[PDB]
Design a protein around this nucleic acid. Structure first.
Ligand SMILES: [Mg+2]
Ligand SMILES: [Zn+2]
Lengths: 132, 217, 101, 129, 221, 83, 71
RNA sequence: GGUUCGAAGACGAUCAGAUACCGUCGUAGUUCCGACCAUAAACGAUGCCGACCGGCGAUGCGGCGGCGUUAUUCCCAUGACCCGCCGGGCAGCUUCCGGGAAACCAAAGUCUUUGGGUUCCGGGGGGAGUAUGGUUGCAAAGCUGAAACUUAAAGGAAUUGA
């Protein structure tokens, strides 16, 4: 029976969006940050807010948090352990290009290319669904 | 868009289209998208006429360029496919992206914090974004849409007849619109290939990024 | 007021359809209006299977099924909980409910 | 069966206009229809039209503009006296400014304005405004 | 009393850049700020409550009687609007009714009966307005006829600015909700009706957003 | 809309739909006005002029605003006549 | 009007002539019986001799006696 | 002619009472041939003929065209499937065609912007489909069909409660 109410959750999302750069993984430090930055009128409410702040922020890193949108910021956190393309997606060899592509392809002046090979056109049609 | 040797399809765009699979419609036809189609296969798929696709793409590019404040051209995609392509388009041109979940009321509810008043809507699929179109009928707001063969043209003012189901096709179609907007403005030259690769716009699904994470290590 | 576009039956271009007797009652209802069910049960139940499986002379005898075609009047169909009342909009859905396992 | 041909011609124009078509097909053409449509055109409610000529009753393809509100027939063809043009065009037409009642006189088929001009009665066919 | 506008049109109005309500009606922009109306036709507009109407919903114990105020508005020179508002208190209902009436004011077009001399006094042609069962037909009348009509549409046609008009209402006109709405549909239709006067090919000018795009970048983000 | 004198007397003139020739009313919020850019013949760059088109609310929700814009553009010589 | 032929005059007239009898007020006037049954016999007032006084008990929610007189 | 079932009726139970529901019997009838009667929620509760105004997928009959599959193994050619087109029919789904008090209806649309042709028929609720006269039928009854008098509502669709 530990469901946080809208008060604790909304306060947590507003605190992160305004002060992302101070709050961290440690509960005790960002308890003290939330204490200072937010004039919260009770100690049990401060602890529950601080508690949920170091749950939201401990999942911002993992990725797709919905309610809180520092959007380019989550994107720039995504851009840290980057697997950047040295040779990017479509820098490749001969391309599979449908013999019926090749009739619509020489409907221009293109008949061929270095990395164009014309494979085999489609055989048979198992496509529709019996009407039962 | 047409009657100009400058603007006609050059010696790359077709192989790019035919590689992406832009020319492949659905199995069903909408009665208002008959004019944009060439012929139906045995296999039961419609082949889109790339020349009119191209003419619609340049007329769309004109309508986007004509806006003086590039800020208020709202670009939208709710499906997984277009959510990157719209952010890349918007970052390139200066448009205002809404990638994933358009909240109903951002045009007619002035009280909302996320309340825009854009001057030209651009949508990736009328079926997916049936909410911004119908909400763009309450404020005087012309629309561009990456319309498939079966996508309805209700409240759609420029339908770009493409294959908006495929990842490579959507990404390429957004890339080609972005490039044309900048070419027509005079940011990029007409004759030299744009130094951006069209693969920046494609949807990298979490399984294939796990593979690319593995591939680099 | 008109409740169902088709008047609770599958009659469109006739005028007369021979009536049929409810299995529970013996009420005469039109053949097309009657709630039909096709029941395919084994002659023995579930737990009696293993008793009659091993107390049988034949090795690998697939014992037969009893096939019963039940007609109900609307009264019996609702009472025996074959059909129930539905939402004003959800009444329209003709798709038979899912049988998977 | 087809008892009034002008009635169906004007109803098919009216539906085509409302629906927002650029042109319409009238099936069984006649002198009275062509003479009705020339009166319409002369004020400029329809554009040009081309009467397609098979070896039967012809067909008419009328170039519609979007400046016609209503074109309606009056059956039966009542004997409108000259002193009755006012009390007809009072309740048929929208205003005293625009709209016309074409009526078949001895002179030909023409509107209430020219029937008053030449001092002639006749029979009401229809109205356009 | 200070008005800090939450819309883009409301901004352009307050900065003295749009200088008539016709430059908004021309472009069919949805007016969502009430202060735009109170800026242009500020001192001119006159309110009048047509009726306060109590409506009751049956709940667990007893009714919930809440009130419903029909408010006609408009300067007596070419603008009229009708606003309905429903709230728990009659003070709140009348206030919100005046505001909703203001947001929905329209240009009434006026023409002549026959001789085309003086200023336009009556309805340009015959117009019909429909709401539920009620049907209100406005017919043009000769000069100094007055408004030959029922008291509800009379005071709507008075406030619109029409001097002379015949009417012929049919249906359950006792319903003051639909009677006044059918009248408002009829008046509003006067300018969405094509006559041989509006035949000259339209010459398109620039939208107030397009023309003052340069200003809206720096005045508010 | 002038009297016997010739003073233009009605308070404004409503725009007419470029397609259907209907007039776009004061509270017609489903109408549009779309400026299509003009290209310089040789350079392929935006001049600073455009071919504006107004369209009625009924035409849009019918779904002919697309084919209507197409015909207007094709007539103005924006879109190629082969297409 | 339903039938619109240029010599359907006896039809439209005879139809209306028959259908006016279905009007309650028209029939109550044009048939004799209403006048034949009316105690006044189609007159404004009438003189009559009082033969006794009568207390008529009023209808529902109203509760009183009415000072009627038999004439 | 009489198998089944079953108004009437004979009981047996239940019930405060049961002249009913439930159960065992059961004549007329139910079936066939020949004379009548002419009515049903005889319903699409929706006259008929004609024209015009969106889209989609199927379906039954006829035609027409086309990769391919299977039988006649010799497959010309017919039959069974497959993909589309045309015309008539029973229906369905969908939409701001449009209408409507709405429920809803591609007709119940093209209606104050009112007129394609024509037949029947309605006028607040009762009294009353009663009285009376006529006519049809062996009888039951059918078709036509008022008045005095009484009355401020009866009613239709949809909403929120109980
Ligand atoms: Mg029957
Ligand atoms: Zn039963």
């Amino acid at each position: 029976g530990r469901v946080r109410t809208k008060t604790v959750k909304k306060a947590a999302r507003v605190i992160i969006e305004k002060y992302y750069t101070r709050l961290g993984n440690d509960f005790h430090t960002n308890k003290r940050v939330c204490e200072e930055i937010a004039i919260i009128p009770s100690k049990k409410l401060r602890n529950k807010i601080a508690g949920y702040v170091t749950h939201l922020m401990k999942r911002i890193q993992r990725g797709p948090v919905r309610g809180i949108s520092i959007k380019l910021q989550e994107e720039e956190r995504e851009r840290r352990d980057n697997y950047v393309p040295e040779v990017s997606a479509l820098d490749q060899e001969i391309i599979e290009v449908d013999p019926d592509t090749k009739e619509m392809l020489k409907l221009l002046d293109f008949g061929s290319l270095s990395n164009l090979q014309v494979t085999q056109p489609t055989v048979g049609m198992n496509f529709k669904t019996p009407r039962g | 868009s047409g009657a100009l040797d400058v603007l006609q399809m050059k010696e790359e765009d077709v192989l790019k289209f035919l590689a992406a699979g832009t020319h492949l419609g659905g199995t069903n036809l909408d009665f208002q998208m008959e004019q944009y189609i060439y012929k139906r296969k045995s296999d039961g798929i419609y082949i889109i006429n790339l020349k009119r696709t191209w003419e619609k793409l340049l007329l769309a590019a004109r309508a986007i360029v004509a806006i003086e404040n590039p800020a208020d051209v709202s670009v939208i995609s709710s499906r997984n496919t277009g959510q990157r392509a719209v952010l890349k388009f918007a970052a390139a041109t200066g448009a205002t992206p809404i990638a994933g979940r358009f909240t109903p009321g951002t045009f007619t509810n002035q009280i909302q914090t996320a309340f825009r008043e854009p001057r030209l809507l651009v949508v990736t699929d009328p079926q997916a974004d049936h909410q911004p179109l119908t909400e763009a009928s309450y404020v005087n707001l012309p629309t561009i849409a990456l319309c498939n063969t079966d996508s309805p043209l209700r409240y759609v003012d420029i339908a770009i007849p493409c294959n908006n189901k495929g990842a490579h096709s959507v990404g390429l179609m957004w890339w080609m619109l972005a490039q044309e907007v900048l070419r027509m403005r005079g940011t990029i030259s007409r004759e030299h290939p744009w130094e951006v690769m069209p693969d920046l716009y494609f949807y990298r699904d979490p399984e294939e990024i796990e593979k690319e994470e593995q591939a680099a290590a | 007021t008109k409740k169902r576009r088709n008047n609770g039956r599958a009659k469109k271009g006739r005028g007369h359809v021979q009536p049929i007797r409810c299995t529970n009652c013996a009420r005469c209802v039109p053949k097309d209006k009657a709630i039909k069910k096709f029941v395919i049960r084994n002659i023995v139940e579930a737990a009696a299977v293993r008793d009659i499986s091993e107390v049988s002379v034949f090795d690998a005898y697939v014992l037969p099924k009893l096939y019963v075609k039940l007609h109900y009047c609307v009264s019996c169909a609702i009472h025996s909980k074959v059909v129930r009342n539905r939402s004003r909009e959800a009444r329209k859905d003709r798709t038979p409910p899912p049988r998977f396992r | 069966v087809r008892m009034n041909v002008l009635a169906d011609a004007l109803k098919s124009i009216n539906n085509a206009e409302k629906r927002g078509k650029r042109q319409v097909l009238i099936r069984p053409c006649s002198k009275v229809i062509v003479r009705f449509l020339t009166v319409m055109m002369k004020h400029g409610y329809i554009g040009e039209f081309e009467i397609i000529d098979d070896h039967r009753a012809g067909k008419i393809v009328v170039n519609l503009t979007g400046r016609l509100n209503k074109c309606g027939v009056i059956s039966p063809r009542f004997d409108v006296q000259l002193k009755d043009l006012e009390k007809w065009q009072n309740n048929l037409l929208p205003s005293r400014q625009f709209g016309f009642i074409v009526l078949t006189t001895s002179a030909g088929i023409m509107d209430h304005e020219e029937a008053r001009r030449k001092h002639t009665g006749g029979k009401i066919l229809g109205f356009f405004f | 009393k200070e008005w800090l506008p939450v819309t883009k049109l409301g901004r352009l109005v307050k900065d003295m850049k749009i200088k008539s309500l016709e430059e908004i009606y021309l472009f069919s922009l949805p007016i969502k700020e009430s202060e735009i109306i109170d800026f242009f036709l500020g001192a001119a507009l006159k309110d009048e409550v047509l009726k306060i109407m109590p409506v009751q919903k049956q709940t667990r114990a007893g009714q919930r009687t809440r009130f419903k105020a029909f408010v006609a508005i408009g300067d007596y020179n070419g603008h009229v609007g009708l606003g309905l508002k429903c709230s728990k208190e009659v003070a709140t209902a009348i206030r919100g009714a005046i505001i909703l009436a203001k947001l929905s004011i329209v240009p009434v077009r006026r023409g002549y009966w026959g001789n085309k001399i003086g200023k336009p006094h009556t309805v340009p042609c015959k117009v019909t307005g429909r709401c539920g069962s009620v049907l209100v037909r406005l017919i043009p009348a000769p000069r100094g006829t007055g408004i030959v009509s029922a008291p509800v549409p009379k005071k709507l046609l008075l406030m619109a600015g029409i001097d002379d008009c015949y009417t012929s209402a049919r249906g359950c006109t006792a319903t003051l909700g639909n009677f006044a709405k059918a009248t408002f549909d009829a008046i509003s239709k006067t300018y969405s009706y094509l006559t041989p006067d509006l035949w000259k090919e339209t010459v398109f000018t620039k939208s107030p957003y397009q023309e003052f795009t340069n200003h809206l970048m720096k005045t508010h983000t | 809309m002038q009297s016997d004198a010739g003073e233009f007397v009605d308070l404004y003139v409503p725009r007419k739909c470029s397609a259907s020739n209907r007039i776009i009313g004061a509270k017609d919020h489903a109408s549009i006005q779309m400026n299509v850019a003009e290209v310089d013949k040789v350079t392929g760059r935006f001049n600073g002029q455009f071919k504006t088109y107004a369209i009625c609310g009924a035409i849009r929700r019918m779904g002919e605003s697309d084919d209507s814009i197409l015909r207007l553009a094709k007539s103005d010589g924006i879109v190629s006549n082969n297409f | 009007g339903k039938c619109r032929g240029l010599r359907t005059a006896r039809k439209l007239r005879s139809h209306r002539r028959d259908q006016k009898w279905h009007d309650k007020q028209y029939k109550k006037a044009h048939l004799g019986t209403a006048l034949k049954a009316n105690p006044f016999g189609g007159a404004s007032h009438a003189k009559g001799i009082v033969l006794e006084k009568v207390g008529v008990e009023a209808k529902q929610p109203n509760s009183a006696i009415r000072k009627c007189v038999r004439v």
